[PDB]
Design an enzyme around this catalytic site. Structure first.
Site, PDB file in Angstrom:
ATOM      1  N   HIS A 185       0.173 -12.696  -3.223  1.00  0.00           N
ATOM      2  CA  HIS A 185      -1.134 -12.013  -2.667  1.00  0.00           C
ATOM      3  C   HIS A 185      -2.179 -13.221  -2.231  1.00  0.00           C
ATOM      4  O   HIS A 185      -3.121 -12.770  -1.655  1.00  0.00           O
ATOM      5  CB  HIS A 185      -1.558 -10.639  -3.195  1.00  0.00           C
ATOM      6  CG  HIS A 185      -2.991 -10.988  -4.335  1.00  0.00           C
ATOM      7  ND1 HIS A 185      -2.925 -11.076  -5.454  1.00  0.00           N
ATOM      8  CD2 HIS A 185      -4.120 -10.891  -3.879  1.00  0.00           C
ATOM      9  CE1 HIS A 185      -3.929 -11.072  -5.990  1.00  0.00           C
ATOM     10  NE2 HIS A 185      -4.749 -10.917  -4.732  1.00  0.00           N
ATOM     11  N   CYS A 215      -7.573 -12.872 -10.607  1.00  0.00           N
ATOM     12  CA  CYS A 215      -6.406 -13.186 -10.010  1.00  0.00           C
ATOM     13  C   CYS A 215      -5.715 -13.956 -10.563  1.00  0.00           C
ATOM     14  O   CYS A 215      -6.511 -15.360 -10.368  1.00  0.00           O
ATOM     15  CB  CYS A 215      -6.148 -12.719  -8.776  1.00  0.00           C
ATOM     16  SG  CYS A 215      -6.740 -11.073  -8.293  1.00  0.00           S
ATOM     17  N   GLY A 234     -11.657 -13.006  -8.238  1.00  0.00           N
ATOM     18  CA  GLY A 234     -11.133 -14.196  -8.241  1.00  0.00           C
ATOM     19  C   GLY A 234     -10.732 -14.363  -9.709  1.00  0.00           C
ATOM     20  O   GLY A 234     -10.247 -15.312 -10.268  1.00  0.00           O
TER      21      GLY A 234
END
EC number: 3.4.19.12
Lengths: 5, 301, 301, 5
Positions: free
Chosen positions: B41, B145, B143
């Site tokens: 992603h 992730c 952030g």
């Protein structure tokens, strides 16, 4: 709806 | 004595965190031998969400596009493929600090440590459980992730989680390190709900065995109950059913405190029925489902 | 979002843990430049307890006596002095992995991470607070001694705790890295009690500001109260008095959520008065005093 | 009483 983070 | 939620020491993992950027998106990534893993992603922008095709968006991407920072330094991308929800990015260097390790898929009920990072550097570590409804309760800001989940077994790091997204409920969703998501979730932005959750009955029981072993003892009672009689109640109060394999596991804990599991269950049955008329069990005023029988062992004795 | 008790990443400290042995005693120790710190209480055996003189017991000790293991390897002792409750042991090597760092004395109310070790290697990390009665609630088994407490500020490690002993209550006691104990405690084995504790009112308030910022909001009310009127109640329920410096600190949190501190206090006043008629505030069913205003900031926004 | 650990 959702939260791609 | 004492009993606190404990997280594996984050040292060995700290040295595998890197930062990844692709356009107007920056998220963390995990660097093992000459490889770097992260959530596919990354390569989307915020109209791609609605409906991205990943195979499509990725075929128009160069390694030119991928900026990999390991501290001040930077890493070249060479290869790059995709595993379900993750990009595997070949790089010019194997990590000096790559430890022994494996990739296991944890199961709902087991717990793991989480090292929470932003911009390819870590800022915090906390212990949590892989919920029965397949999500988890983390603390995760934008952030976050790329942040990973993991255990340690002697010296080898069992990798089991990489964070991808937060849900409408405020809980989080992610994937093992093969790319396969935990639960029924997908990378899109769609109507998506955390299915209603239940309580990890195996755990609460490991947790009572703590209280006892620590010395707390007020919750017990002379009774017993069949297994089947226990569940009937456990369902009403929204707990998972307890199976025989569960009852086996608690074996050594009944063997250390000398309290039959089915007795414990009678106590728990009673605890559900009555609440605590307001009082502490090992600190808490609620029943604590985030400890494995196994973690009550590492930590108690 | 989400909100969990979080511990600083233990990486930089992991590489400072070593094992120390002196006779029939083994405990952990901390290795900075060419120095190794640990609890003097290593050099006693279990009749020395009752009444040890340390200056005395130490004057009959050689560096021959001190076995220092850094993994498989071993370190020679050269010098060795004593700082209040700690031995400073000079060794033949400065630690390759020694980071930037300082030695601060934390104050009751501030929190820190704990890296729990056994035999000079770490096994777990958890966050806790420096209680108002000066002890702490840790998980510590025999051989835990030597385990350190600490924060991180950018890149420098602020060292503030080394664990020495567990109390009759099951709580733990220890010292800063100058050797000066936190609280009224000493290395002997004597009649010793954890003086009755209170609740970190500054914290519970930082904690409510979490709930709000996360979105939870049911605890608030139209009222306000003087400061003095708040305390009168806060005392009854065994909470620390709230001072103006406290009220200043909460400044930016009232400025982020737009809720006047003295309002929050009215809510808390109300919360004490009424309990929750059984309901969750940010997960808990009790009021949570182990978060700094500062930790609700790192972690929320 | 106590526990030097």
């Amino acid at each position: 709806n959702s939260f791609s983070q | 004595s004492g009993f606190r939620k404990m997280a594996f020491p984050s040292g060995k993992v700290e040295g595998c965190m890197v930062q990844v950027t692709c356009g107007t998106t920056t998220l963390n990534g995990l660097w093992l031998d000459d490889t770097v893993y992260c959530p596919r992603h990354v390569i989307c922008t915020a109209e791609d969400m609605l409906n991205p095709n990943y195979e499509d968006l990725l075929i128009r991407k160069s390694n030119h596009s991928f900026l990999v920072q390991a501290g001040n330094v930077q890493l070249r991308v060479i290869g790059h493929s995709m595993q379900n929800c993750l990009l595997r990015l070949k790089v010019d260097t194997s990590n000096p600090k790559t430890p022994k390790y494996k990739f296991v898929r944890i199961q709902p009920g087991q717990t793991f440590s989480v090292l929470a990072c932003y911009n390819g550097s870590p800022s915090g570590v906390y212990q949590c459980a892989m919920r029965p409804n397949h999500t988890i309760k983390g603390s995760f800001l934008n952030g976050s992730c790329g942040s990973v989940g993991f255990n340690i077994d002697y010296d080898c790091v069992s990798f089991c989680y990489m964070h991808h997204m937060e849900l409408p409920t405020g809980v989080h969703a992610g994937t093992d390190l093969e790319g396969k998501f935990y639960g029924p979730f997908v990378d899109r932005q769609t109507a998506q709900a955390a299915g209603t959750d239940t309580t990890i009955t195996l755990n609460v029981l490991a947790w009572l065995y703590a209280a006892v072993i620590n010395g707390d003892r007020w919750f017990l009672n002379r009774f017993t109950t069949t297994l089947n009689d226990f569940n009937l109640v456990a369902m009403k109060y929204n707990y998972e059913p307890l199976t025989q394999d569960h009852v086996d596991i608690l074996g050594p804990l009944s063997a250390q405190t000398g309290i039959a599991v089915l007795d414990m269950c009678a106590a728990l049955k009673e605890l559900l029925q009555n609440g605590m008329n307001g009082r502490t069990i090992l600190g808490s005023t609620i029943l604590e489902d985030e400890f494995t029988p196994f973690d009550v062992v590492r930590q108690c004795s």
